[PDB]
Write a protein that binds this ligand. Sequence first.
Ligand code: AG
Ligand code: AG
Ligand code: AG
Ligand code: CU
Ligand code: CU
Ligand code: CU
Ligand code: CU
Ligand code: CU
Ligand code: CU
Ligand code: CU
Lengths: 5, 465, 462
Amino acid sequence: SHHHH
Amino acid sequence: MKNYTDYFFDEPAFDLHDGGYVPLEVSDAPEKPLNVPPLLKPDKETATDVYYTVTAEAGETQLLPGAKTKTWGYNTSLLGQTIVYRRGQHTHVTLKNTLPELTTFHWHGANVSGPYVDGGCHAPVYPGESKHIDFTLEQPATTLWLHAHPCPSTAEQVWHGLAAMVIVKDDHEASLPLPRNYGVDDIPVILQDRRFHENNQWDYRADYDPDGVAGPTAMINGTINPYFDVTTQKVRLRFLNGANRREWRLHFADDLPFTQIGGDGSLLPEPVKFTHLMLTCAERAEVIVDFGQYHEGDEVTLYTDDVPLLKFRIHAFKPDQTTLPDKLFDVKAPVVDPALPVRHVVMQGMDEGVAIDGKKFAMQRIDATQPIGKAQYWDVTNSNDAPGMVHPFHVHGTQFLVLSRNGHAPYPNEHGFKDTIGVNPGETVRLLVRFDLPGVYMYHCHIIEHLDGGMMAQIETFDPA
Amino acid sequence: NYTDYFFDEPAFDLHDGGYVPLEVSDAPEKPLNVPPLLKPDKETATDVYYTVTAEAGETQLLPGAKTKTWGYNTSLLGQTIVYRRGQHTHVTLKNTLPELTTFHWHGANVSGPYVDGGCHAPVYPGESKHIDFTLEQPATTLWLHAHPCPSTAEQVWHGLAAMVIVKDDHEASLPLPRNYGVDDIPVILQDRRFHENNQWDYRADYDPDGVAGPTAMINGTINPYFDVTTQKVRLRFLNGANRREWRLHFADDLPFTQIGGDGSLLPEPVKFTHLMLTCAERAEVIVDFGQYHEGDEVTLYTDDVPLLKFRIHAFKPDQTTLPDKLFDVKAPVVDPALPVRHVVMQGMDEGVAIDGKKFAMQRIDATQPIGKAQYWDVTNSNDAPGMVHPFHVHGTQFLVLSRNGHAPYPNEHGFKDTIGVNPGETVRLLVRFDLPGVYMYHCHIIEHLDGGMMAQIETFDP
Ligand SMILES: [Ag+]
Ligand SMILES: [Ag+]
Ligand SMILES: [Ag+]
Ligand SMILES: [Cu+2]
Ligand SMILES: [Cu+2]
Ligand SMILES: [Cu+2]
Ligand SMILES: [Cu+2]
Ligand SMILES: [Cu+2]
Ligand SMILES: [Cu+2]
Ligand SMILES: [Cu+2]
């Protein structure tokens, strides 16, 4: 799981 | 690499920092197959000549459940049928306008004559009227596009749906190992956003903002909540930022790699590997995605930032052992004319203050001249800072090369021919610019609201004899 | 069996296929809005200095939400601008709209194409421009409106129009009502269609043959009444509609006297019971309420639709009477070296054109030497059923010589800048340009203007 910004 | 952005552009200048930024929101609309604009069938075609009719028209399109949205399009109700051109092929196009407003037919990135064939501000076509144009492209294979370009309002007409992808084929690109089965393993991905109001209608005037118009709903090839059925291992996506102002920060949910093979004006010299790609207005990027690690039934989603855009449903496919060459295309860089000086172009201002070289566009005034056949250094500066935006600088009737960014190397994907380049706040980029044909050509910011707000000038090219 | 108007009844808008009848709104009656006089920045006898700002705002027209409108130094329409013959006039044009516009002084003898403020004189949002001119023309009513090419129609619809009064010595010596807002009022005649939340939507109502809505709007007012406190009232009628014709008469068929048209006082006063105005025509009339008493109400109509209620109050008797001669019209001699110019307006809908072609920003269609009067034969070629087309020419005030080889209408012996040409009809005009420049000529059904029923002429010094 990785989020962007 | 945790304190760093994954994109090449300056992170403080990103649109999401803008005072009036409009975040994208996922729509509740149903999932449906990505609309793939069909190829426009020529009226007639030989090996030497091709004949087309392009008709701008008003209609309705089911986009959201309920009432149909009023839209404009080319040979269809929204966007347009994809138009194939060939290098060296004599092309004959009949332009027809069945809109209730006058319009223009601009072939963005097409090295054609101006100001008429180029179809910018000086090529109006009234309701009911037809025009004829003729040209032969002497340019590499690449992805271009067509859109309305009255001065003004280009913004309004693009919002009412007037854009279509134009594919340019050549012999060199045909010989490379690339997905090329249009609709199956090679697809347009026209990236736009809209705001739907009551009755699922658009209203450019209500949403107007002088620093760029942006809606919360993404729309890909005129589709809300699209999915695409993958039936091959490798897929080619022809990305086009057809938005008024929004930037797209593209990446798969799981950081699946993809290889960029082409930009605005040509194949890249070498393939460039990406997990994250940012595109400013009017930029094109052609990428190969390899889905070889996924199983049948899997669904891989393409994101902008944290918002899902396009879902890839993975079916069974034959293995693909093909592999891209180290080199895709030979970039023959012209020598600079020593006689010519450095041209300085300064994009300046925000909102209503937007200008170039201290002045707003005027239809009648020629701002600059340059000889044909002779290459010149253009230093192009985005003047605004602090609160700043990345300004996509575009020049009609040419394909330039990017030499430097603030004295430093251009971005990894900028070593080919481009017609639009994102200039960061405070930045000077150096282009190498040569015009082949005589005529009047504009250059401008491609945030379309800036274009309409006068952030535009025109250059006259002449034969020195 | 006979129409009371001068024009050809078959060609009246009300026979058009897509005719929209006016309907009286249910909105409450309210005082007629009288746009205030624009206060100058500075004024001497020799110079006047004005700031004109195109701005976007909101106006209460119907109950509920405010309508989103444009205006000049106000939210809708504009403050009345007073110019004086022979006074050096300095105007700052300022655009605080969200799109580019133009400042056209319809009927002003000024230079073009910049001061004139036509297609070629854009002003971008946030920008300013400076113009300087001196009017050398007789007293009359003109107006200001937007004129981008296109869309003039859209911007006029948004509300960009304002009355311009040109004063002079001769008119000042005449016995006319002249107390602006008490016995001398603008009557700007428009129509609109109100959509949800009382908003306008030009694109929704668009029609290439002319845009009309069912709700009359007088000086940016719905269902107006005006309090009369004098025996004599001067009305300055302006047809500021996109397409619609006004067929004006009072209850009781109360007479009224026309004293002026587009470009000048009429040579002689002309008594009417019924008067028809096409787009951009102006007519100044004197109404006499001598027969009426306190509390009497006198309705101004178009066709059978009430527009404006005059409420009579007690007034001082006014026993002035208009001279037999208001104004001396000195007709120039036609230069015999010059040919007869033939201008043909043709087509309907998206086929509208002039002399077989649509307007092009780049193309000069005509030339004429300044200081030299020339016959223009202007033909409306539209087969019956057709429209009355109001032909307009920038930067001049012409004289009307004939209609189909016959006398012009009784109110057409003065100077005019707009003339209603009937289907099939050829009118001969006498046209002289004083100043050099580039000037448009076109139909003033505004949608036809935008649809390219427009050409341009260059005037030069010999
Ligand atoms: Ag990522
Ligand atoms: Ag900004
Ligand atoms: Ag008609
Ligand atoms: Cu473009
Ligand atoms: Cu372009
Ligand atoms: Cu352009
Ligand atoms: Cu006018
Ligand atoms: Cu005019
Ligand atoms: Cu005009
Ligand atoms: Cu007309």
